[PDB]
Each structure stands twice: as C-alpha cells, then as structure tokens.
Design a protein around this nucleic acid. Structure first.
Ligand code: DQV
Lengths: 249, 257, 249, 257
RNA sequence: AAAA
RNA sequence: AAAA
C-alpha cells in the first residue's frame, strides 16, 4: 500500500523518521512527481499524506499539489490523509486567501485528519500508521527483531481486520514482498538481509503461502503455529538451522 | 519415503508399472543405479539418511524363490531389519497357497515362513490391478506420517492443473516432524516436458487436504521459479493462486470446483 | 453490540477507562467519523454515548454531532445514552442558546440519561455498562481471570434477560467473538491470548455451541455444567490440559 | 470405539457391507492393515490407546472354523480378553444349529463351546438384513456410553443436511467421561466428495438428541472450517444454525421439521 | 436438548 | 485447510 509524502523542508526532519516507521510496516513509501504518479497500478493506489503545517500553508506552489491531489480524489482514485504538525487551533488560516481558507476548511471537516506532535512520538506514530491501515485490508505492524532460544529473528506481524477477507483479495493486493528484502547488510530495508524472517498472526493458509513463497533463497522462513505456540522453521538458508525446529516463546 | 525394489526379471513387467504408480505418490523409488554417490546395490544403501530409511519391497514369486543369489539379499535386508533400521514389505505376485516352498531347503523354508507370519505381507495380482496398487501403496503409508495420494491432473474452469493430495493420519503430527521428514519436493519436479516425474514441468501445482500452515508453507516454498502454486481453502472450497509463473494467471484467482 | 463515544478531550481521562471496562464486557467500542458510520450492519447498530459535560456543552462544532445522532435516532436506527460527567443540577444551560437549551432539555427528560462521577466509580461503571444492556438481549459481564484448582482461567459470564430468546436471535446478533481474541500477549483484548476461556451462566445449547466454535485453535474452551457445578474442558490447546477434566469451584 | 474384524474371504462379501453400516455409526473400523501403523495383525494392535480398546468381531462361519491360520487369531484375542483389555463379539453367519463342530478337534470344540455359552454372540443372516445390522450395531453399543446411530441425510426446508443422532444410555454419564472417550470426530470428516466417510464433505452436519451442553460443545468444536454445524433445540423443535461455512446459510436460521 |  |  503505497504512500506519497507532500511536505516542506522545514518539516523535513519529521518526515523521513515518520516514513522510516511506516517503511518497517511493509508499506511502500515514495518521497523523491506525485500528481501524475497517482495514475499507476490499481484503483487502490496510495494514501496522500498532507504534512500540513504553518510553513507548509505559506507556499502557493506547494498548494497546487494539494488541489490536483484533492481534485482527483473525488474520483475515488486516491484518498488523502492530512497530517497536522501543529494543532488545528494555531493553524495560520488568516494569511490564506478566501479561496484557500474555504478549500482547506472543507477538507479538514468532511475528510479526516490526524494530529501529530514531537512530544508524544510513540502515540503519534501509531495514530499515523493506523490511519494508513484504517481503510485497508489485513494490517502489517512494524518488524521487530527478537531473540528466541538464542536465535536472532525478525517477526512480520499482520492482523486481519474483522475475521475474513475476500477470496479474491490476493488479486487486487498491491504488496509484493520482494521489494522489501535487503540485498546488503548496510542497505536499510523492512526485512534485514540474511536475517531469518517469521510470520505471526492468525490467517488463512493461502495468505501464509503467498508471503512465504517469495522468501526462497532470500531469508530463512519461520511460521508460527497457535496449536502449541512455537515458531516452526520451514526453510534452511542459514547454517545450523534445520527446517522443523521449534522456538519456545 | 524411499523405496528399494528387490525382484527378478521374470517379474520385471509388473515392477516398474507398480513403481510408476508409487512414484506419482511422491515416494522416492530406487531400483538400479541412481543418484546416491555410495556403493550402489540395496544392502549397503540401507545405511543412508535417517533411521526412517525406506521400506524393502520383497517381490516374492515362485521364480524369485528359485534364485539363491537373490535369496542372500533378503537375508541381509531382514538381518538388519531386526535392528529397526529398515522394514520389509513382501509382495506376493502369486498367492500364498501355490508358493513353491517344497523346492526351498529346510533353512530357506523356515526363514520364509517366519517372516511371512510375523511380518505382514501384501497380496498382488494382475487382474484386480486398481485394488492391488492401492493395497501396495497404502502399506507404504501404513507406518508413515501424512500420506501422499498419486498426482491427478484435473482441468478446473478451463485451466490445466495437477493436485498434490496429502492426508494426515490421525489428526495431528509432531511439532518437530519436519526435522525428520526425508521428503524434499525439489527432486520430484520435472525439468523437461519429455522427462517423466511426479510433478509435470511448467504445469501449475495445487495442494489439497487439511493440514497445518507450516506444512503448506514447507511444500509451497520449493516451488518458486519452478511451477505455479495453487492452495485450496476449505472456508469456501476453491483453489487459491499464490504464485504467477505462467502467463495469464495472476496470484489471487479462484477455481470454482 | 457496537458503541460510539462522543466526548471532549477535557473528559478524555474518563473516556478510555470507561471504555476499557466496556471492552471487557464483549462490547464493540469505537472512538477514533461517527455520523455516517451509524449506517453500517443491522438495525441494531449501536448506542450513542453522549459524554455530556460543561466543557462538552461549550463547543458548537461538537453540538452538531449530537444533532445528526439524535435527528436520525427518531428513525429508530440508533439510540443515544447521554452520560453526565457532572450532575444535572450544575449543568451550564445558561450559556446555551434558546434552541440549544430547548433541544437539550427535550432529550434529557424524554430520553433516559445515566449519571457518572469519579468518586463512586464501581457503581458508576455498573450503571453505565448495564444501560448498554438494558434494551439488549443476553448480557455479557466483564471477563474475570480466576484460578481454580491451580489452573489459570478467564470466565465469560453471560446472563439471559427474562428466561428465553427468539429462536432466530442468532441471525440478527452483531457479536462475533473472533474480533475480541488477542493475538499477542502484549496486545490488550477482552480475551487474553492463549489463556483458557470458560463460559458461565445458563443458556440454550446452540448459544453455547455458537460461542465455543470460534475458539478452535485460539484458546482452550471450558464449559460450566450446573448438574454438579464444575467446569468441563472440551478443547485441548494448552499442554497438560486434556478435554474432560473438572475444576472444583 | 474401534472395531477389529476377523473373518475369511468366503465371508468377505458380508464383511465390508456390515462394516460400512458400522462406519456410518461413528465407529472406528479396521479390517486388515488399516491406517493405524500398528502391525495390521489385530493381536498386537489390541495394545493401543485406553483400556476401552475395541470389540473383537469374530465372524464365525463354517469355512471360518476350518481356517487354522485363523483359529490362532481368536486364541490370543480371547486369551488376553480375560485380562479385560478387549471383549469379543462373535458373529454367526450361519445359525448355531448347523455349525460344523464335528470337524473341530476336542480342544477346538471345547474352546468354542465355552466362549459361545458364557460370552454372548449375535446371529446374522443375509435375508433379514435390516434387523441383523441393527442387532450387530447395537451389540457394539451395549457395553458402551452414549450411542451413535448411522448418519442420515435429510432435506429440511429445501436444505440438504445430515443428522448425527446420539442417544445417552440411562439418563447420565460420568462427569469425566470425555477424558476416557476414544472418539474424535476429525477422523470421520471427508476431505473430498469422492472419498467415503461417515460425514460427507462440505455437507452441513446436525446434532440430534438430548445431552449435556459440554457434549454438544465437544462435538461441535472440531467442525470449524470443515462443515456447517446445526444444533437441535427441543424447546421449539427446529434445528439451529451456529456456523456459516456454506454460502447462503447464516448462523441463526431455523429448519421447520 | 434453556447450564442433561 | 481462517494460525490443523
Ligand atoms: N491385506 C492383505 O492383502 C493381506 C494378505 C495376507 C495376510 C494379511 C494379514 O495377515 C494377518 C494375519 O496373519 P497371517 O497372515 O499369518 O494369517 P491370515 O489372517 O490367515 O492371513 C490372511 C488369509 O486370508 C487371505 N487374505 C488376503 N487378504 C486378506 C484380507 N484383507 N483379510 C483377510 N484375509 C485376507 C490370505 O491370502 C490368507 O489366506 C492379518 O493382519 C491380515 O490382514 C493381509
């Protein structure tokens, strides 16, 4: 589920670090156009992140990017999530013209925004990440590297919203995990290079097979079974680890 | 689950065709001279892999009983069988009633009678072939974990596909069963259309039957860049496409069965 | 039985903790729109919790949410439960306009409210939770974790109002228990992850089967039999516990 | 409640068809070398599971009584039966009047006569098949807990459904009976439409008969993601849907019987 | 069979 | 077969 970030360099500091958290959530993130890049892939294109801030509002040549993003949003192709670096109370609406203020007020009331602050970072990141997963199918929590039974491992946590997904959901899914696997240890990616990868959370068998298959010759695959609650090794790419061992959690 | 065939060329006709059915059941089959870098034969090839080595198929027949130099192969197979390394399944081409035990010496007859009563045998005949093949194949799966039925090529919704049917005996398997499993599916995938293998080359492969998620992942994973993988979901009972290696097939389509 | 919370951040402190008690009662709770989200599911949608307070009354842009909630409430789709953080005596009705005061007074007299205070918390929570269960079918008390015969277990207590339910009540029930099962020990949910779950209270056999079935491969299921009054184990997902043991209460 | 069948191929025709009726009664049936890895030989396969192992079905017949390779089968079955591990039910294909006892030796006749008088037998004939099958099936359920009638597929309100009828003998069962029950319903659910099993694949399954709530929950739970579950309520006497695995059926509908 |  |  791709993400396009529209922001100003005054907010550059918060943007990548916000994105870095979003990248670990198996989310495609694109920063450095964004207008004609909307028309790419399936109808579920991306969610526009409008990094709204006082300095962001003061650039007209940044404003027109919000127009075409919102103008085609009525077509249903893309949906926007406005991120408020500063609270709504002290947003400098006075400097905006009558057309600019009327446009901004309409999209802040009818369309839902997310408030962000540097202080309560953990809660702010969770609210930002979850809003990405509000209107989306099975979620994807950030990858956590945990050591179980002395073995280093990373967990790919995914939660299904509700209790079921469409039987043809895999057809319209725009998430392929080959793009999130690191090729070098120094290269930063959601999935660490050569580090064993584990899948956690309830789900259908085909969903587990769909995520496990692209990991052949890339990382060691671990599968969690809730019958007894230990991880199951299904792939042997690292030395000393055989397919079938259990990790007592 | 490997299989070693001991037989005579008078029964050669039934042996491969019996083996051909067993090969489609995802069973490793070894008759003459294959891929092991050991010393060949069937005696010292028993000591290879894990304690679950193989099941000796003694193709017992009247002409088979008449060769002494074929008899000693049954001795060393049975002599080390008491150690628990290998178990023998004697296949009777002819019924027990007309087995020529008289020509056998006192030691040979006493040895054969002991292993036919204590050890379990399977009767085979050319006439009732379908039932005979099922009895032979299932005896391979009697003392084994999750079974593997022969691969069947079925066309669903106009799409050619082969089904890998596996059934779990009981309702559970050990959580560490995958460690001691001696079945890796990379050796059963055909590389050329003319080459005969349990899994057809480039033909989409489907997994059928209830089982744990790790078992499905373990079987699906070695099929990357080899065949299109289909997974059966019992919630609504259609096959689910998870891999796209053939043109025109996307991961996520359903096959109404 | 879903619940939508309308409140101000001055009352934020009481809201989640009120909700946390309601979540343990197998109640769907939704906080962070609420207007167009009313039209979802069956006619038994939810009960609007109007967290009425003096600071809540002072926001006009919070008032219009109460209008559309009440305006469509006359259609019978949703019913509102107004929660008074402060007593009716000192509610600042004077600051409200003539239309606002007339609207509020009409809904406080004809429609029933619930009084809440921080001091008598246990009684206040019980009154709030029960008002959710007043116009509803078989109730659901908060989950209690009790240790019987040295075995950790949680009890799902449900009480049937009256002595019978409609034979087709399960068709229109909007409670599926798969959404209330925790997937991780750190994740907070009404049902603890991997902790054995027990069902308590008289009821029909199909109701017991309906609640027990979604727990396969999720939690160990215990059933209470009133013939001799010990819990009966029917599922074995945890080690050392076989289906058929009894817990002397 | 497992069942081991000892018979001769002259009575093969009646054996499976007798077993087929018994299989529909949620009874584990093992004729020869069945799934159970335990050496087919029903003898050492007796020592498996709980003290309530199985009931030996001695398919007694005139040609069976000439089967010396079979006379032994009974000895060890009866010899350990005195230990209380297994009980035998002798099935008389022919009536007691014309049983060829004369050909039997003095030891054989004395052994057979002792077990036919002190231990109870069941008479079977091809002619009155329905009554004979009922007598055979019920003798399996005589010394057993809550019974299990054969599964019947009935169409109620235009909906196809199968009923699992179970009757409790007496009016109560031990509170810890589920601990020692050797019946798990996962082994009786079909995985393919062509595969024959007590429970049809994807066909909704209904539970009928009075019983405790935990017994209903114990039987309903293993059916998740396997079949649609229906529960009968005697308050108003319609079936109640609790699981939705088939399209068009919601949990909560009623079937007017 | 509405804690049998 | 929706963590068996
Ligand atoms: N499954 C087989 O084909 C088979 C063949 C031979 C034997 C067996 C297994 O022998 C076990 C008993 O020890 P032992 O073999 O010493 O004696 P015994 O029981 O007298 O052997 C069977 C006699 O009957 C014929 N027959 C063939 N098929 C069957 C069959 N499915 N059920 C019954 N009888 C069968 C066979 O030719 C012989 O005359 C017992 O576990 C039995 O299943 C299975």
């Amino acid at each position: 589920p791709q993400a396009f970030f529209s922001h100003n360099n005054k907010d550059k500091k918060i943007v990548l670090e916000v994105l870095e958290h979003l990248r670990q959530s198996l989310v495609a993130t694109w920063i450095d156009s964004l207008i004609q890049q909307i028309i790419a892939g399936i109808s579920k294109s991306q969610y526009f992140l409008a990094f709204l801030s006082n300095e962001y509002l003061k650039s007209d040549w940044c404003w027109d990017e919000l127009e075409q993003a919102y103008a085609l949003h009525q077509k249903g192709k893309v949906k926007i999530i406005p991120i408020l670096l500063t609270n709504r109370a002290q947003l400098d609406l006075n400097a905006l013209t009558d057309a600019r203020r009327n446009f901004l007020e309409s999209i802040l009331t009818r369309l839902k925004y997310v408030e962000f602050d540097p202080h309560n970072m953990t809660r702010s990141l969770g609210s930002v990440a979850e809003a990405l997963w509000q209107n989306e199918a099975v979620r994807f929590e950030p990858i956590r590297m945990i050591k179980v039974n002395g073995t280093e491992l990373q967990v790919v946590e995914f939660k299904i919203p509700g209790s079921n997904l469409p039987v043809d959901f895999l057809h319209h899914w725009d998430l392929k995990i080959e793009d999130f696997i690191a090729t070098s240890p120094n290269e930063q990616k959601p999935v660490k290079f050569d580090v064993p990868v584990a899948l956690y959370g309830p789900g259908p068998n085909w969903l587990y097979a769909f995520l496990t298959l692209p990991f052949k010759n890339r990382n060691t695959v671990f599968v969690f079974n809730s019958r007894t609650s230990e991880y199951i090794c299904v792939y042997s790419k690292s030395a000393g680890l055989a397919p079938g061992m259990v990790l007592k959690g």
